[PDB]
Amino acid sequence: KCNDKRKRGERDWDCPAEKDICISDRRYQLCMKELTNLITFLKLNLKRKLMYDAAVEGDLLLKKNNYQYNKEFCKDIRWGLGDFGDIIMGTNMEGVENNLRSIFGTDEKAKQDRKQWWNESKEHIWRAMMFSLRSRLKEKFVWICKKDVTLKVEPQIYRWIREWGRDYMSELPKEQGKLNEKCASKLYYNNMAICMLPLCHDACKSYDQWITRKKKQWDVLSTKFSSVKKTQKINIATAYDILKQELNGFKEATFENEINKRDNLYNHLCPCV
């Protein structure tokens, strides 16, 4: 069953015990129903099932962002399609396996360019994901989801890093906001004392929790970026460069400085830690 998607932020990234990666709540909800249900007829049937799952995923993603056609939505479409890809192609880092065996007993157990099969049609799966929204907007529909960037095949590690980047850059002003709202004091307050006092202390340590799991996540995922190329190698090198390419304003310095709690704001508001 593909259930209604939970709000982004309700469950942060999950770096499971003893694992090579960190997974988002966006994929734990990824519609994989018709896949985990099951000549050329086989490939056609799997194609249709994937059409169903992709369409439902698109619809539930639209519902997830309160029926708002925007950048976050397009991003989620991109990630979902990519993950669908690594599922089909079988190059998924993530840990079921009933679809990894179903899609195996339907095609091949030696060399498997199901690669090309996905390549032959992923555009169509994409229109399947974009189906709901476009059928809802009708004539009023416009293309704000840049297509060939969305269809361009890339190792998920990359995709998940971009997604994580958007998540972090989206959560940061919120956390800084609530921290500042519960710690900021007038210029004649000793902010050390305010920091110690319960209200600002709890908030500061909550911030600490958030930035701690943020650094843990980025650690695992970056070690994971450097994990792959070595093993895989074969279009960018600086893991950060990906992040440099994702959002409008990103400098490495401020980032490292933020996740290592060497932040100016954090060190000013809560110095009692």
Ligand X SMILES: CCCCCCCCO[C@@H]1O[C@H](CO)[C@@H](O)[C@H](O)[C@H]1O
186: left (phi over 0), alpha (psi -120 to 50) or beta: beta
Taking the complex as a whole, the smallest distance from the CB of residue 191 to ligand X amounts, in Å, to 12
Cα–Cα separations (whole angstroms), residue 83 to 12, 32, 50, 155, 157: 18, 11, 12, 10, 10
Answer whether 227's CB lies under 8 Å from 20's CB: yes
Q: Does 39 bind ligand X (CB under 6 A)?
A: no
Among 187, 190, 198, 231, binds ligand X (CB under 6 A): 187
Shortest distance in whole angstroms from residue 174 CB to ligand X: 22
Smaller CB distance to ligand X: residue 41 or 188? 188
Q: Is 142 in the site for ligand X (CB under 6 A)?
A: no
Question: What's the min distance (Å) between Cβ of 267 and ligand X?
Answer: 20
Alpha helices for 103-197 (secondary structure H): 115-120, 123-129, 131-137, 147-151, 156-181, 191-196
d(CA 136, CA 133): 5
Nearest approach in angstroms of CB 201 to ligand X is 21
**Which lies closer to ligand X via its Cβ, residue 16 or residue 177?**
177
Q: Is 234 in the site for ligand X (CB under 6 A)?
A: no
Binding segment for ligand X (CB under 6 A), chosen from 25-33, 40-48, 74-82, 186-194, is 186-194
Please choose, out of 134-142, 184-192, 227-235, 265-273, the segment that lies near ligand X by the rule CB under 6 A: 184-192
Query: Between residue 42 and residue 101, which ones bind ligand X under the rule CB under 6 A?
Result: none
Interface with ligand X includes 181 (CB under 6 A)?
Answer: no
* b/e map 116-145, b = 16+ CB within 10 Å: ebbeebbeebbebbbbbbeeeeeeeeeeeb
Residue 17 touching ligand X (CB under 6 A): no
Point out residues after which the chain has a gap (C–N over 2.5 Å): 38, 95, 234
Among 18, 143, 188, 231, binds ligand X (CB under 6 A): 188
Judged by CB under 6 A, which of 138, 186, 230, 233 binds ligand X? 186
DSSP conformation class of 165: H
Closer to ligand X by CB, 142 or 187: give it: 187
* Residue 266 CB, nearest approach to ligand X (Å): 20
Contact 80, 13 (CB under 8 A): no
Which residues of the chain form contacts with ligand X (CB under 6 A)?
186-188
